[PDB]
């Protein structure tokens, strides 16, 4: 089974051209919690964002024009991708947004992150129906010394 991992704020922005006004430590630990010895697929332009492979996962990267790191696996297709996944109980798809709208109607869990925070976004998490999705999990936190603003992870199951 295929999984979207995502932090979303106001309006479902998930990316700008500049690093985002947010410190959050804790969603960095709970995306390694649940990526951790899982496959990753992620687009180019997530990539470079990164700039290394992510340590103890098989990372695959989407990209049209030829791999300029072989560390890691590079495909040419949504199909690929997932072959190049092999036989494994379940897929991560971290991003960025061209990969999720190619992916969201595979996937059937959703590993989201709600930010309250409003910024300035050219990308954003594609629309989804929560009819569709059943919440499993749920956890707020309110903003501490650590974590800028408040924010709460949600697992969802599609229906």
Known sequence: MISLIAALAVDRVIGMENAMPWNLPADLAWFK?????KPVIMGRHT????????????????SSQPGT???????????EAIAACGDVPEIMVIGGGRVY????????????????AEVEGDTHFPDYEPDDWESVFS?????????????????????
């Open 101 to 116: 709208e190619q992916f969201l109607p595979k996937a059937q869990k959703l590993y989201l992150t709600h930010i309250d």
């Open 47 to 62: 990539w470079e964002s990164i700039g290394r492979p992510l340590p103890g996962r098989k990372n695959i990267i989407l």
């Open 33 to 37: 919690r649940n990526t951790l010895d």
């Open 69 to 79: 790191d072989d560390r890691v696996t590079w495909v040419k297709s949504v199909d």
């Open 139 to 159: 956890e707020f936190h309110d903003a501490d010394a650590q974590n800028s603003h408040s924010y709460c992870f949600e697992i969802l199951e599609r229906r």
